[PDB]
Design a binder for this molecule. Structure first.
Ligand SMILES: [Cu+2]
Length: 157
């Protein structure tokens, strides 16, 4: 089964587990705060879907899990997510827990050293849709208007 148990921390320091994602459909994106193009564009596109949901945005989970736990602490994630829709929840964790979640969600993440102790990460770019029971449905299509993506997500309410 794609996905597994976890215990992570949101950008406000609140504990978040797999069990707390149950009851709502869930979009998940794995990335990192120092990503130059893919992450801000993906998280912007998700943000527009959440805006197009209106009041229903509170009835889904939209989760950004960092694959760069050495840098993406709650405070870093909070400030990063400040630019994006406020419904996005950013999850940080102990390196052990992130490595576990990466394996159970079949994520690819690889550090790529640049220069002077800095680095980028190659990583999975797909958006995961999990149902309200936490069961993987499919990857989620963002190549369409925010309203079309919102209408699709609403079917999982
Ligand atoms: Cu990225």
């Amino acid at each position: 089964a794609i996905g597994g148990p976890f215990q992570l921390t949101d950008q406000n320091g609140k504990a978040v587990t797999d069990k707390s994602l149950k009851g709502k459909p869930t979009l998940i994106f794995f990335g990192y705060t120092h990503c130059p193009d893919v992450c801000p564009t993906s998280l912007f596109e998700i943000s527009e879907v959440l805006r197009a949901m209106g009041k229903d945005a509170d009835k889904v989970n939209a989760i950004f899990i960092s694959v760069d736990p050495e840098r993406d602490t709650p405070a870093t994630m909070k400030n990063y997510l400040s630019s994006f829709d406020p419904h996005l929840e950013g999850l940080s964790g102990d390196p052990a827990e992130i490595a576990k979640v990466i394996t159970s969600y079949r994520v690819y993440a690889k550090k790529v050293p640049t220069k002077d102790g800095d680095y980028t990460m190659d990583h999975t770019a797909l958006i995961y849709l999990m149902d309200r029971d936490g069961r993987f449905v499919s990857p989620f299509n963002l190549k369409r208007t925010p309203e079309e993506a919102a209408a699709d997500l609403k079917r999982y309410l």
